[PDB]
Amino acid sequence: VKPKDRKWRGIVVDGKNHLMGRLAAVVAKQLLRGESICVVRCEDINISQSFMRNKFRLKNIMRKRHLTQPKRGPFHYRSPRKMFEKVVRSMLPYRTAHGTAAFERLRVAEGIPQPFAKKKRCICPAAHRILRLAPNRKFCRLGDLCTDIGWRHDKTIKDLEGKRKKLAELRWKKKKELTKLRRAAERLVDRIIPRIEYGDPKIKIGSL
Amino acid sequence: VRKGPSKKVTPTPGQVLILLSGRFRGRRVICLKELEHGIFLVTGPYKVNGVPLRRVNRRYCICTSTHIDISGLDLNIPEAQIFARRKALKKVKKALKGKRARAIQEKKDQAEVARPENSFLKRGKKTKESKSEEAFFEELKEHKKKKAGFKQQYQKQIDEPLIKRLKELDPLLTKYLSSIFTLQVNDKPHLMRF
Amino acid sequence: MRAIYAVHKTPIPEGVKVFVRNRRIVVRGPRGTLKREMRHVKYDMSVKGKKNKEFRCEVWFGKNQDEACIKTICSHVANMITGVTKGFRYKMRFAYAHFPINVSISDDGKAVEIRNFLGEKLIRKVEVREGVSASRTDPAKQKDELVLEGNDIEKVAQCAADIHQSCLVKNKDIRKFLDGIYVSSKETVV
Amino acid sequence: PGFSGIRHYEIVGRAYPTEKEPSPKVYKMTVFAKNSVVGKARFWKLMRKQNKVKKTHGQVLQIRRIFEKNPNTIKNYSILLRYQSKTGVMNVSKEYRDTTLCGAVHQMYMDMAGRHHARYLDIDIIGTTVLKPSQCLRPHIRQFLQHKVKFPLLHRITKKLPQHKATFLYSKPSTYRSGFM
Amino acid sequence: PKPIVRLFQPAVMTGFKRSKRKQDPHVAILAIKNVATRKHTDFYLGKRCVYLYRGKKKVAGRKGSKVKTNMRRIWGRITRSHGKAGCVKAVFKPNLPGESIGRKVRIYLFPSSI
Amino acid sequence: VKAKRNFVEIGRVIYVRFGKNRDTLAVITDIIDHNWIFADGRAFPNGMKRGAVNIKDIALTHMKLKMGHGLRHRHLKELVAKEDVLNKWKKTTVARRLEKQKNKLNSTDLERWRIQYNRRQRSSLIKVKFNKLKKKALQTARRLHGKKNPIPFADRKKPQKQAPKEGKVKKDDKGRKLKDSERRKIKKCRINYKSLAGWQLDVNPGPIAGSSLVSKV
RNA sequence: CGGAGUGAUUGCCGGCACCGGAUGUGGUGUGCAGGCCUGCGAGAUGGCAUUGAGUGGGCAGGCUGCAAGCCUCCUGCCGGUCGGACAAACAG
RNA sequence: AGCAUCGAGGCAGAGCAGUACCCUUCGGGUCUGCGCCAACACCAACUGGAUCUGAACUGGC
RNA sequence: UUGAACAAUGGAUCCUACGUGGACCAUGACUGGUAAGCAGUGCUGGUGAUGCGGGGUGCUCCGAGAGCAGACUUACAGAUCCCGAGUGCUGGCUCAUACUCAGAUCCCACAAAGGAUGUUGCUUACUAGUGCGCAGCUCCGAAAAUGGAUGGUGCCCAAGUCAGUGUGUCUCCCUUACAGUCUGCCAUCGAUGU
RNA sequence: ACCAAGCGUCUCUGGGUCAGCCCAGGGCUGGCCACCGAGCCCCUGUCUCCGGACAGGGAUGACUAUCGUGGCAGCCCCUGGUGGCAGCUCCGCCUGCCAGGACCUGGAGU
């Protein structure tokens, strides 16, 4: 991991199965409240409507260009991570000092790179697609939309994620064995010193 | 099941308190008695906690639900001699404008404050000075030394029968008071009874 | 209005087993095995028999579209049963007025070829799905006849439709110029 | 249901006895209104426009808020109402399973607002009645009129207080559990 | 070393008292950790609170410590609640700086009443 | 689905979570509609008082009674008594999670210190014993699924070694072995050394099966 | 200080072996035993379970590598602070 | 804040274990059991509302 | 019963220096005109002369009116984030493949006739099916020229829309205007004792 | 003298606990008298293993004993305050030194 990211500490949010704008808004409010957040797996973020509807929405968005010089015009990113960063930017007051401080606390990433794969990632219940969208309703995928408008790196990240998942499975099995024998150690000590629990009327000044 | 009315949570003699601030943060002490309204004499024993005979605001301590049954212990202390005033020439900065309330609520305070004594030259506090920065420093050292030695008398006079009582009561209380109270990430003060 | 309960059932014959879990229906049978991930919906899809088995698809508090999609899922499973028991076989008959449509199955099983459709010098290559066999019938039985047989009605019928849409007529009155390869019957291989 | 924000009143009124009419007729309305103010309002809105007796020339003899006798048994209330639309008036018959008549009326009002964009002051309750389960003609009522209705909770979202609404929820949720936490 | 002990609750300064387009820099809004309802702010009502920031020069430290430090302190009090989601209105002296927003503030358990 | 479920039916024992009678038990005595039920729970400690509850507010317990709609208290209390629903509930996992939570809530300072001192005592043992078991299991994994030296023993140039300071005690350690209780515990846990060797970097043990429970609510 | 428990942890001397390219699993990596696995199990505590000395077999190994002592408990001696002492930034 | 916590998928789903099976295309399905609150003692429990853990006191003897 | 109510520091008698004498806006009260941010009128209030809160922005809309401060409380209107205030609670309805993204508080920033077996409800004629219909949302009708605008983001059991609810009582009904209440000070006009 | 912490007076002000009046809600005697028949209940068989289906029959569905309706009883409860199933209207009353009690907890001025 590069030095500046070795220095990194914060919360890691699994962006998979999340509604894009609700995610963005939760992340934005928390960044303003001063949290550092890294929204990981931005290709697996969900958007609330049909694939074709969102494809046409992105088409009409990218229609907007500065006619005198486009290289100065609205930038329309092909990466899911960068699209998400722009939605979060829009939710933030990025044209102030505290607003740019929040936006620089934002730490969006694609796939799951290393400083964040070494960390416990969470999910926002509000903004979660399963917990929010009715099953009746349709939804799309940000990586699908981004490969539709370009973004040649979907499969490149799919392979890397498969590799990461194999390593994670190895570590998960080792962790299962270690938690087995850690319960073993706990019971071995439960023989020596019985665990005193909160549900006890014995804990008092005439006892103890 | 009875909610009951609201009461003023207040320290009682023999109640385990938790100091909220000062040199001894979060240490558990035993409230001995009240000196002034809202100011209490405590000591988590200098052998148990390391907290000497001390005073505390009712506002910088948590009143836990741990009562020690301090019954039958000699808690008599020369509070004025032990704790000096530290503000010499008590109430003279301007010539007294008169105390011109004549019977009640000025006289009943002025007489009640002319009753108490004054920490005399040894048990009082020493205001600072230079005297070549040392003729005061050394004498202050031995003044402090003899004052501490005079306070140790009463402190042990309380703490020798007070430890013999808490060990007599149940032996884990000494380690209960040796342990310091801290907040961790999963402790929510607005939900913690005491 | 949301019906508390709706269920549609499909009786399963003996000799066929319909496994279902996570709405991924697998069907075994003498003719082979099929799978179908009907996971685009959120219904029950269990199999609930010991002596005489049935595939029941249920919806709790659904709307009429759910009471209809239950039946369409059950119908898909019934067609999978048919495809694994008796198989599907679509017979396509050639129709031409002047130009003999010359059809040729390629080196492998795949790639039906249409030549001389309407005199056109183009050649229509239709590479068939894997899981459906196309065979040109001998003229004794029926001349100008192709048959597509398989275990998946979707695959077989889509190969038939692919051959059809390859041989279509452009720029002419299609009330005249009635040429093309037309599905003459939707049968079973039994 | 819970807190049908509607109180039922049985208001009784007449006109001030003039010397030509020393005993004017007496009318008794049944009003489902938020409070007695709105109740008496509706009573007079009917007194005028059906009897030419005006709030200023009339006289309320009783008001009598009515409380539900046994709110622990479910009833099937059929409400006959009429309401005004953008076009004219339409007659409606709806029915609701509820433990209280005021409950069924609040249910009717919110249902009419939902389905037809009707409003309180644009709905006028014609008679209400309680039906035996053999007299309910709607499907969404006849489906619960069985004795042992039974169903699971499948895509549940586990409502929880704001005190412990996990903003980050480092665990993995599951929409199909029993949902104690 | 001596036991370092934690007798405060962290909060975040969530800006000043404000309407949509104007603000009152005298009354700061603070969101306290794990406090997410208005009922839970009755504990912290009245408590003292300090905002810690770092200067460059060394200012005098604790009262009587006679050692300086780079930390600087702005003390205040939690005066009331703010809304329903567990924010409080606190008043500081001097008024909290502008780069205090989005930063941590310690809320001590004194004056205690329990 | 192949999982077994809990249904909303007349006779269910439900867990009322919201209201003045929060965190109590109740019996579904009728089902108003698909959103509301009518529940009576006054056959329980400080339970509800026979009202109408919302399905978002309730939670379904694993058990159910054989009763008709709107059963009176006279019969409902004797049914919950005969079927022993209170104990059958207190023995569940959710009951113990909720009870540990509520006991942490209502615990005094002396109780919190007693639990903290108990865990500070038991940790001095759990840490050492878990390190021991982990060490021995990883050594077993190395001995089984590793790569042993092709060079035999007593035929490898054994390394340099320091001297014991010329003035030190010997002080042999008896804890250099797995005690038979520890060995039985490991043999019961039946570690998969395949998995223990498949991953090289040490990992932290997760939580434990009943970490958040209080036995015998 | 010292006593018990525990033999875990850290650091170092060797050598051996093993990994890591998404931003090396490298935060310039990891592990290394008088032992472990499987049987018998003297005895001792509870009414067969727990604990537990040794011992058979098999598999390995720095054929006890060195230094410290963390942690829980028990017990102190001399000297020092006890003047931030009723709060003043987690006593820094 | 103690700067403690890294399976994947799923959500209309049993969980877990198996050196069992098929390809139904390599992660899906089947099969065999209920020991995995490792004696008994629960729900086929499981949304972090959790788990783990006391920054621990002045020098030397 | 001093013979209706309410209010009232007021009634009478004068003198005198100026500015103004382009108006405009809003409303079935209208007239001319196809109409107009057109022209001309009526009552009243506003703008001009007027700041402040909200309507993104806006001389005229909605609230309210303005000495300097402190505390509390609210109006209009609001609470996904921007942005203070609930990703409130309780029932519905709606899914919209475009370049008008379905829709999204007055003024106001458009939409019609006509059509739909999309969907939700209701009435009604026929003996469960078949007809007429009627309301809610949705779709078509629906075309302009720099790239662009429910204000942006985006939202889909909504962050759209229709209701209800937040009670001196509420697990979450809270936010705040220069408005209301209390207080201090400044100034003005007075009353009283001097 | 200043800065800060604490305790009070008075004037306001925000948020709470128990109360009191009057009612309500229930519970037990499976209370008593009279009605209800179904949202059903029970016993069989068959098909089946379906969180069941159907055909039979039964008011011994009696004796206490599923549920509801009209009226009349005694005794018990913290279990509540019209977000309830309500008193001599509507409305629960009372708002917290001036319709009268005991307290708790913040803030502003003094």
* Contact residues on chain F for A114, CB-CB shorter than 8 A: none
* Min Cα–Cα distance to chain D from E83, Å: 13
CB–CB contact B182 E9 (8 Å): no
Residue nearest to nucleotide H19 (CA to C1'): F194
Rounded distance, CA E76 to CA E78, Å?
Answer: 7
Give the span between the Cα atoms of D90 and C73, in whole angstroms.
41
**Residues F14, D179 contacting (CB under 8 angstroms):** no
CA angle D165, D171, D175 (to 5 degrees): 75
Secondary structure percentages of chain E, helix, strand, coil, to 5 = 5, 55, 40
Asked if strand H comes closer than 7 Å to B172 Cβ, the answer is: no
Q: Is A174 within 8 Å of F199 when comparing Cβ atoms?
A: yes
Rg (CA), chain E: 15
Helix (H) or strand (E) holding B169: helix B137-169
Q: Which among C182, C150, C149 is positioned nearest to C167, based on CA atoms?
A: C182
Q: Is B68 at the interface with chain A, CB within 8 A? A: yes
Contact F38 D178 (CB under 8 A): no
Q: Which of residues 1-30 of A touch strand I (CB under 7 A)?
A: 19-22, 24-26, 28-29
Closest CA to E87 of E109, E100, E105: E105
Cβ atoms of F78 and F65 closer than 8 Å: no
Q: How far apart are CA C115 and CA A52, in angstroms?
A: 38
With an 8 Å CB cutoff and a minimum of 3 pairs, decide whether chains C and B touch.
no
Please state, in angstroms and rounded to a whole number, the distance separating the CA atoms of residues B75 and B92: 33
Q: Looking up tokens 């036995």, which residue turns up?
A: F215
For residue B183, say whether its CB is under 7 Å from any atom of strand G: no
Query: Under a CB-based contact definition with an 8 Å cutoff, are residues C42 and C22 in contact?
Result: no
Whether any strand I atom is under 7 angstroms from the Cβ of A64: the reply reads yes
- Quick one: how far is CA E57 from the chain centroid? 23
Q: Which residues of D touch C (CB under 8 A)?
A: 139-140, 143-144, 149, 151-152, 154-155
Nearest-angstrom CA–CA distance, D45 and D39 = 10
Q: Of all nucleotides in the shown strands, which has a C1' nearest the CA of D133?
A: J39
Contact E29, E13 (CB under 8 A): yes
The answer to whether the CB atoms of D98 and F32 lie below 8 A apart is yes
Q: Which residue is nearest to nucleotide G51 (CA to C1')?
A: F181
**Experimental method of this PDB entry:** cryo-EM
Q: Which of the residues D155, D157, D167 would you substitute to probe the A interface, choosing the one with the greatest number of A C-beta atoms within 10 Å?
A: D167
- d(C-alpha B138, C-alpha B130), whole Å: 11
Whole-angstrom distance, CA of residue C28 vs CA of residue C9: 18
- Binary contact (F59, D178; C-beta < 8 A): yes
CB atoms within 10 A of CB B162: 23
C188 C-beta less than 7 Å away from strand I? no
> What is the spatial order of strands in the sheet that B39-42 belongs to?
B54-57, B39-42, B28-36, B15-19, B61-67
| Protein-nucleic contacts, chain D 117-146 to strand J, CB < 7 Å | 132-134, 145-146
| Distance of F51 CA from J80 C1′ (whole Å) | 13
Collect all residues of chain A within an 8 Å Cβ-Cβ radius of residue D173: 123, 125, 128, 130-131
Residues of A in contact with F121 (CB under 8 A): 193
Q: How far apart are CA E96 and CA A159, in angstroms?
A: 51
Q: Inform me whether the C-beta atom of residue D173 falls under 8 Å from chain A C-beta atoms.
A: yes
Q: Which nucleotide is nearest to A127 (CA to C1')?
A: I87
Whether the CB of D176 is below 8 Å from some CB of chain A: the reply is no
What is each CA distance from C179 to B36, C118, C186, in whole angstroms? 113, 8, 20
In this structure, the number of other CB atoms found within 10 A of the CB of residue E18 comes to: 12
- Of all nucleotides, the one whose C1′ comes closest to residue C58's CA is H12
User: What one-letter code names the amino acid at F203?
Assistant: V
Q: A122, D169: Cβ pair inside 8 Å?
A: yes
Cα distance between residue E76 and residue E93, in whole Å? 6
Strand I proximal residues, A:110-149, Cβ < 7 Å: 126-127, 132-138
**Distance (Å) from CA F203 to C1' G27?**
16
CB pairs under 8 A between A and B: 12
Residue A129 main-chain phi, psi, to 5 deg:
-65, -40
D100 CB contacts (<8 Å, ≥6 apart)?
A: D4, D68, D71
Task: Return the number of other C-beta atoms located less than 10 Å from residue D13's C-beta.
Answer: 23
Give the residue numbers in B contacting E (CB under 8 Å), as ranges.
8-9, 20-21, 25-26, 58-63, 180-184, 188-191, 194
- Interruption sites in chain E after residues (C→N beyond 2.5 Å): none
Contact E37 D165 (CB under 8 A): no
Contact between C3 and D143 using a beta-carbon 8 Å cutoff: yes
Q: Does B38 contact strand J, using a CB cutoff of 7 Å?
A: yes
**How far is it, in rounded angstroms, from Cα E48 to Cα E57?**
26
Chain-centroid distance, C-alpha D100: 9
Q: Which DSSP string do the residues of C87-133 spell out, in sequence order?
A: -EEEEEEEE-SSS--EEEE-SSS--EEEESSSS-S-EEEE-PPTTEE
Mutate to test the interface with A, among E101, E103, E104, E105 (most CBs of A within 10 A): E101
Sheet containing D89-98: give its strands across. D89-98, D75-84, D123-131
User: Whose CA is closest to A62, among A151, A134, A127?
Assistant: A151
Resolution of the determined structure in angstroms stands at 3.2
Amino acid at A156: T
Distance, in Å, from the CA atom of A103 to the CA atom of A88, rounded to the nearest integer, reads 8
Cβ atoms within 10 Å, residue F75? 12
CB within 7 A of strand J (chain D, 69-98): 69-74
Tell me how far apart the alpha carbons of residues A33 and E15 are, in angstroms, rounded to a whole number: 9
Query: Can you give the length of chain B in residues?
Result: 194
Tokens standing for residue A104: 């620089």
Of F105, F113, F117, the CB nearest to B191: F105
The dihedrals phi and psi of C10, each to the nearest 5 degrees, come to -135, 110
In whole angstroms, what is the distance from residue E43 CA to residue E34 CA?
A: 13
Q: CB–CB of A5/A32 below 8 Å?
A: no
> What residues have CB less than 8 Å from F154, skipping those under 6 apart?
none
Q: Name the maximum alpha-carbon separation found in chain E.
A: 50
Q: Give C176: exposed, middle or buried? Use CB within 10 Å, 0-12, 13-18, 19+.
A: exposed
**Which sign, positive or negative, has the C-alpha torsion A121, A127, A128, A129?**
negative
Query: Which positions in chain D touch F42 (Cβ < 8 Å)?
Result: none
Upstream peptide bond of C30 is cis (omega within 30 degrees of 0): no
Q: Which of B19, B36, B47 lies closest to B152, judged by CA?
A: B47
CA dist list (Å): C109 to C150, C165, C183, F104: 13, 20, 20, 71
Question: Are C and E touching by the rule of 3+ CB pairs within 8 Å?
Answer: no
